[PDB]
């Protein structure tokens, strides 16, 4: 009477993909009724087919998610460090720098945005008639 009738990696992928929301499925609950699933989860993570959240005390599988993107790891650590090192320019000044560099900018500076009688003798019949000012 396992909560999720999952016993093979193919079945796990089908269940995760069918999820309507992004709420994860607890590996603690999934492991119940499955004699071994940590190896399967780790193998799938290596294949980059499922997203896995792991504990901090020791690497241990937890809530998993369907991977809708490409390879989880595709960039060398050196380039990741370089990406972190670069500091983004001023929010408003970024489009100007991109245009100067020769690249078409997809955004614009927010500062450029724009934010946007005499007595009436006809007495008894003053109200019944509507005002047809134009035609």
């Amino acid at each position: 009477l396992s909560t999720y009738d999952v016993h093979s990696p193919s079945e796990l992928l089908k269940l995760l993909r069918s999820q309507v929301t992004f709420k994860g499925i607890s590996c603690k609950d999934l492991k119940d009724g499955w004699p071994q699933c940590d190896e399967t989860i780790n193998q799938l993570e290596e294949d980059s087919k499922i997203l896995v959240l792991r504990t901090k005390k020791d690497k241990t599988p937890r809530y998993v998610w369907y991977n809708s993107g490409g390879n989880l790891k595709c960039i060398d650590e050196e380039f990741v460090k370089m990406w972190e090192n670069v500091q983004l320019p001023q929010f408003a000044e970024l489009p100007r720098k991109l245009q100067d560099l020769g690249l078409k900018p997809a955004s614009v500076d927010p500062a450029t945005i724009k934010r946007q009688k005499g007595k009436i003798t006809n007495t008894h019949m003053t109200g019944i008639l509507k005002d047809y000012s134009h035609r």
Partner: protein, 196 residues
């Protein structure tokens, strides 16, 4: 529901996976699956406490891949509370990605260009770096060795002479591994995206 939205979504997913860790993918994917997510809802979805979500949200806000929106709420039977929502601003995310990619490529190109320049010199004791031009005015009266001004000790040649091929390989690897971003950016620039 134009394909342009899907292309931008693919660009964000690839960028996050390739240039950010694991929890970053979880946070940004949730706000990509759900257009707007409250701070409380995001925590429940990923089952991560406030402290863990702290660095993720802050880092993604710094690169402008995510945007914040604070508004006051008036629940029918509770005190007014200021809620926080996270959503993706595509024009800024694309612009931030484009500039950051250009900077990384330019930085590597500059490093490759600099390495081809003459090595230079540095003092072993005070660890002060002397350029080729600067050291040429420090050689002793005997024209034998360069003497440090502070230490009055012979200088030692600088390293990185043989790294010329290493930098070229690094540049080649980045461009090979960054091709999907360039292709996605080209497609995005071809079409037009409305501000979100």
């Amino acid at each position: 529901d134009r394909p342009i939205d899907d292309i931008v979504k693919n660009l964000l997913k690839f960028v996050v996976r390739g240039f950010y860790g694991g929890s970053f993918v979880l946070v940004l994917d949730a706000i990509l699956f759900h257009s707007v997510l409250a701070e409380d809802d995001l925590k429940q979805l990923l089952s991560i406490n406030k402290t863990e979500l702290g660095p993720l949200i802050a880092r993604l806000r710094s690169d402008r891949l995510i945007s914040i929106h604070k508004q006051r709420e008036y629940p029918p039977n509770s005190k007014s509370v200021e809620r926080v929502y996270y959503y993706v601003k595509y024009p800024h995310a694309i612009d931030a990605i484009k500039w950051k990619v250009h900077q990384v490529v330019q930085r590597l190109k500059d490093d490759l260009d600099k390495n081809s320049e003459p090595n230079g010199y540095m003092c072993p004791i005070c660890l002060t770096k002397y350029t080729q031009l600067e050291a040429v005015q420090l050689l002793n009266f005997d024209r034998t060795e360069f003497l440090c001004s502070l230490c009055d000790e012979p200088l030692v040649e600088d390293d990185s002479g043989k790294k010329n091929k290493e930098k070229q390989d690094k540049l080649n690897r980045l461009m090979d591994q960054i091709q999907p971003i360039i292709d996605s950016l080209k497609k995005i620039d071809d079409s037009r995206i409305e501000e979100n």
